[PDB]
């Protein structure tokens, strides 16, 4: 505690920490019960391509699966944003050199995210997303990768 | 009472223009010693026209008023406690009849005051009936 | 108290005998009364009042019936009073310049 | 880093310049302090556009300290006058209001730039950084011209309030025995004497270095001297002088109306949208 | 001459003032508790006029010219601008001009 | 009447002021006020908002965040792009060859 | 409150709060800290308000 | 019946003279006398009386008990210092106590229930790196977080799954 | 879901027993609490019962109605005070509520329409029965005939969809995309009327100005949403056609919102001004809805909830002032801060919410529609700036003008605000803020 | 603080006495300005201006015609300050 | 003493309303606090297994 105030600073941190740790250790923790909670696991279900054009249960199965995967994929981007979020705060003032790789991971994920769920808007469903892919692939073999224009 | 009549004599138009002219003079020359000096000269200009025909005077007010407006101050003085003043009628007082809707327990904090108001109410009706013929 | 149907303006006045009743109907002496041009967007026989420097240019020291509006007891109200009101586009004195 | 820096510097410079002149024509005590506040805001916005944070932040805290004090002084003064903000009514308060006038003098000097008051530490370093960086010729002039203007109106206010002979009404409530008002003021007053130096040792973990020729480092003081004299001296009058404000009537009205901004923004605009409301409802909601 | 006219209005408004005070401070009407206002024809006429205007509307050309520029063209010109700008932007996307790297508002 | 200095200082428990729920039966007016407050506040707002807060995770949004971490670790370790750009693998798809299309409009 | 001016009550609260914040600002100056706490309302399309 | 006004028959007593202009233009002798009387009545020669009824009609039972204890120290000390001085001690001993317990609950919450990876809500803290200066421990200090998994862990690195 | 329906049905007899006015709301408030416990819904339909389900979209709109329809009884205490056919009045609301619950809880498009309009007739009785001014006729027809004129053609569009889809159920419809131009106009011009759109809003200022306080609540509270709710279900299979004519609707509503805001500034009637404020915000709701993006859809759902509570709230306050001053004109209503200062607080909070002030749920929805619109076209920034600017221009004029100035002169003595009125205002605004905490639920219906 | 009526009588006369175009002897509560004291219209305007500054408000030009003797001015100021004592 | 009756609208209804609301919100807070305190202190959270 080389500084005068820092010596006074730690004094307060002892005062606010001391009781709560005691209270946590004295009352809350000792009196509680042991109990475990688990994590949902979803068996992969057939994709929309296998579904017939007349059955609705199989379409309904895939539409919900598509939506759950969308959430996982929406926020796998969110996690990657928070990494570049946290590096910029934990590495400043020299943060450009270190966040640059993290942002490269982030920007790639966004494009893959936008290639898959992008431009569907609300009401995006398994059928629409899959059909975007079919049209995208056809254009790829004919006109090459997007951004190069048509021939 | 008396409600003013809109018709204003020519003599009054000169009067008002004189009052506005002097008040405008204060704004330009705030200081009293200077103000009294210039205000005296301003009164002189009116006495050098006091002996003129009205029809000639009609020409005088026209240019007299226009030059005043042409020389209006960009921040004319007012009195803060009067119409147009910065501090005019800041507070608003509700009508009397508000008091009569207090909760009866609230009235118990000023029993004398509400005792009197109800004696006045008895007098007010007789006063009102006579004034307006009931 | 009456209702709106009992107070809406009558059709544009066309005759002097009609003008005088119209001026009566709005508590106006027959010289103030002046209906709108009746181009086709007119307000009917409703008067045309104000439209000057605005409400705030009215004499403040006069003992108005309604000081708050600066209006008298039964006096009509300009069709655009909501625009020339004291807080809306009005001034106490003519602007210095154009 | 972008073109916005070019624009913000220009707009800010005018803001600090305009109110600098406007403060020398306004006659409401409450307004003169307001333009004073606004004038110095342009100073932050301009140096902020250069690319300095501590300088802007440092001055911002400094401005809050004494500017709050000035308004407190005005409130006591006005409440003792008959609720009139005009300075033409006031006068000779340096003896009729000892304590309040003393409370004002410290604040006004802090605005002036008397060395080692709250304002000086911020104003000085800012002006020095301006003369060290790559500035615009027009921006540089406004920076230093405003400082002259900043001191100009401030002593102009001194004359109309303290040194000037009394000019009030016959019945005057001049009194300075409002301790409840005063105790709160001394909280600010203490800070306005030490707020400057205290923050210099804290805000700046890496103090800025400056090395400029004498004939610019002294420019900040010199203009403040000229401004204080020019504002005070011109404020005086006699029986056979020229009302220069009256003579150049058109210019004074322009500078005394803040370049007609209140008119432009309140009477030159509202006419048009409100009419459109009638034409719409007149021709559609009860027409077509 | 016109001076009498000013006097005609004065005494005319004067009767109105006296009548207003009678109703204004009427203890018996205040006595109702019913709440409300002194009956005022001026407000009543104004309120009623504000509501009814079709009665005096006519497609007179001035009204058409007023209404035309008032809404119809602002809608038409601006609806045209929206269609124009989106069509140009849409054409690039359909043609495949913009790589998915450069697509704006990926998340909209 | 001619009330006294004590009729204003000794509040008569005879007349009553209504809370807006009734104007005829005093006990009714208080009775409605009490019950109305209880349901609207003590149940709908207090118990409701409490119950809302501890509501089970019904949208599978907390659950996702757990996936977003586990799913990210498994595939960051697996050498696969963190977000798959294909709803189903491209090789699994069977494109209709060009002659099948026959000028069908293709959009991106 | 009924016997204390709300100005008298108010002043002690703000000054004590101001004084405490002043001590923290010193602490954050010494360590050059940056703390970023945030509570989340709703998220969608890989976004969060 | 429910009389809002409590019997007292509401009216307007002041009359014309309330408005300033209506006074200046003219006032009959009776009006002047009436106006003078009205102002003389507005004077009050005592402070408001203390009505016991309000203090129970505007204090719910919960509040009358929730505050009961600390009003015993107001009753104990009010003959020692005067009602004003003692009550201030009652107000600041109480309102300050809430603050002290307010920080501890806040301090507790940010130490155990901070947002983690198994929830979305809750406060989430991302603190920066302290300035390591000479004399501090191990001066050539470096951020231990190198791999991307280090950042925004939210306690995920130490989960069992 | 039947728990709600049968609860309401057996509360119908309470209309007949006497001295049961106040026992009704408690049963109406208590059921809201019971309904408030059964939130476990998702994007897809849940709690099936013979044709009645509920997803997150329908849930919030249903719960909004139960709350609003419960506040109607508090607001309209004057009907109880004068025994003005109160028993019939109660039966009107209980019937009306049932039609709403079925309308949102219906799983098939034909049903939605069946109870869509059927709710109108209980509203129409409400206006004529208990409205003061003579114009409730000439405003009774506008509400009935604008709606019927555009809803009857919608019925044809519904039946034409059976012969292609073979069913009405919403989920089965989304699998199709139709290309017929007229069909697009037979399922949206019917909802564009009830939103309302700017050029077909002529019924809204008349119905709201003339209807009683309770009718104003539900008209502004739930009727404007049935148009909005209907669109959210039927743009799913009009996506292709929506792209060819959306720019017509977006421009009209956006320009319509601006022009109406100017019209608001030139109003002089409290009821009129609040009603025209409904068209202003509903223009943004419709605009973002037709953008079809994820944000524009979630945001539109949010704002419909928030706006209904607010505009319903602001109709309380106009009724309170009108009840005493006796006139609804702005000129009469001035300086109410000096008569009813406690009331003026509620005026501000409800007024502030209307201008998208924080932390209200209204600002959350408005941030989103604004995002979708901007993404739709950067040219939309022009009026979208104007509309948000003027959307405060009249709100201040509404609040400031009615509360600030010097008091009216002719007003006679009147009662002060009562506890019922304050409690009514709290229930309007207080949820409108706390809902921000759990926007999780009332936002992500997709 | 309250402005006693007696002071108003003193304050008015003090100003008039200081006015150099009036007679300190004729000057009394009841005298007329233009009739008795030989005041001109313009002279009468200047007197009102002193009265305005004396007490701090505007005396409207319309209402200055009722002020034809210091008693009326005394009454006017009393009415404005509603000090009837 | 020497004070002047300044006329203002009655506050009793508002004063009563603030009291009634405060009573009934408390009337719900004590239960839920008991439950949430009972739940967290005695039952406690699960463990992610
Ligand atoms: C910036 C703001 C800073 C953060 C907020 C400041 C206020 C802090 C409040 C208390 C924080 C807390 O401990 O947990 C809060 C509590 C923890 O809930 P949780 O996250 O679900 O359980 C945590 C674990 O499962 C189990 O882990 P746990 O050990 O944390 O268990 C919690 C335990 C912890 O024990 C404590 O609360 C006391 C700890 C500090 C004691 C001081 C010791 C030092 C001396 O007990 C509680 O917290 C019970 C909650 C009481 C809430 C009462 C709210 C209504 C009355 C207020 C008006 O969360 C809430 O606050 C929700 C309750 C709100 C319901 C109100 C509904 C409206 C009606
Ligand atoms: C601008 C828009 C602002 C919207 C509201 C912003 C959030 C402000 C308060 C956040 C909060 O309630 O603290 C959460 C925390 C409560 O815990 P929590 O919200 O962090 O999550 C724990 C689990 N639940 C949600 C079940 C409680 O603190 C409190 O709520 C205060 C103590 C309880 C009352
Ligand atoms: C106020 C809201 C801002 C709170 C900021 C915050 O979250 O706390 C910051 C700090 C935690 O910093 P940390 O890195 O954990 O330091 C200890 C490392 N082992 O937590 C700290 O506050 C620790 C630093 C102590 C600084 C001085 C002592 C704390 C004083 C707290 C305010 C109370 C002051 C009371 C003053 C009374 C005056 C009459
Ligand atoms: C499923 C198929 C069956 C549906 C139900 C069929 C029966 C509905 C009618 C039942 C009520 C009949 C009595 C009645 O009208 O209610 C009483 C009263 C009517 O008014 P009143 O004339 O005063 O009645 C005096 C008789 N008690 O009540 C009222 O004021 C309103 C009554 C409702 C009117 C509805 C029409």
Curated annotation (Swiss-Prot), chain I:
Keywords: Electron transport, Membrane, Mitochondrion, NAD, Respiratory chain, Translocase, Transmembrane, Transmembrane helix, Transport, Ubiquinone. It holds the Pfam family Proton_antipo_M. GO terms for molecular function: NADH dehydrogenase (ubiquinone) activity; ubiquinone binding. Its main location: mitochondrion. The chain crosses the membrane at residues 4-24, 56-76, 93-113, 114-134, 139-159, 182-202, 218-238, 245-265, 272-292, 297-317, 330-350, 373-393, 426-446. Signal peptide: none annotated. It catalyses: a ubiquinone + NADH + 5 H(+)(in) = a ubiquinol + NAD(+) + 4 H(+)(out). GO terms for cellular component: mitochondrial inner membrane; respiratory chain complex I. InterPro entries: NADH4_N, NADH_UbQ_OxRdtase, ND/Mrp_TM. It is found in: Mitochondrion membrane. It is an enzyme of class 7 (translocase). Its EC number is 7.1.1.2. GO terms for biological process: aerobic respiration; electron transport coupled proton transport; mitochondrial electron transport, NADH to ubiquinone. It is a multi-pass membrane protein. It comes from the Eukaryota. Core subunit of the mitochondrial membrane respiratory chain NADH dehydrogenase (Complex I) that is believed to belong to the minimal assembly required for catalysis. Complex I functions in the transfer of electrons from NADH to the respiratory chain. The immediate electron acceptor for the enzyme is believed to be ubiquinone. Belongs to the complex I subunit 4 family. This is NADH-ubiquinone oxidoreductase chain 4. It comes from Drosophila melanogaster. The lineage of its organism: Eukaryota, Metazoa, Ecdysozoa, Arthropoda, Hexapoda.
Curated annotation (Swiss-Prot), chain J:
Keywords: Electron transport, Fatty acid biosynthesis, Fatty acid metabolism, Lipid biosynthesis, Lipid metabolism, Mitochondrion, Phosphopantetheine, Phosphoprotein, Respiratory chain, Transit peptide, Transport. Complex I is composed of about 45 different subunits. This is Acyl carrier protein, mitochondrial. The modification O-(pantetheine 4'-phosphoryl)serine is found at residue 41. It comes from the Eukaryota. Belongs to the acyl carrier protein (ACP) family. GO terms for cellular component: mitochondrial [2Fe-2S] assembly complex; mitochondrial inner membrane; mitochondrion; respiratory chain complex I. The lineage of its organism: Eukaryota, Metazoa, Ecdysozoa, Arthropoda, Hexapoda. The chain holds residues 68 to 152 of 152 of the full protein. It is found in: Mitochondrion. Residues 6-81 form the Carrier domain. One of its GO terms (biological process) is [2Fe-2S] cluster assembly. The keyword Phosphoprotein applies. Carrier of the growing fatty acid chain in fatty acid biosynthesis. Accessory and non-catalytic subunit of the mitochondrial membrane respiratory chain NADH dehydrogenase (Complex I), which functions in the transfer of electrons from NADH to the respiratory chain. One of its GO terms (molecular function) is structural molecule activity. It comes from Drosophila melanogaster (Fruit fly).
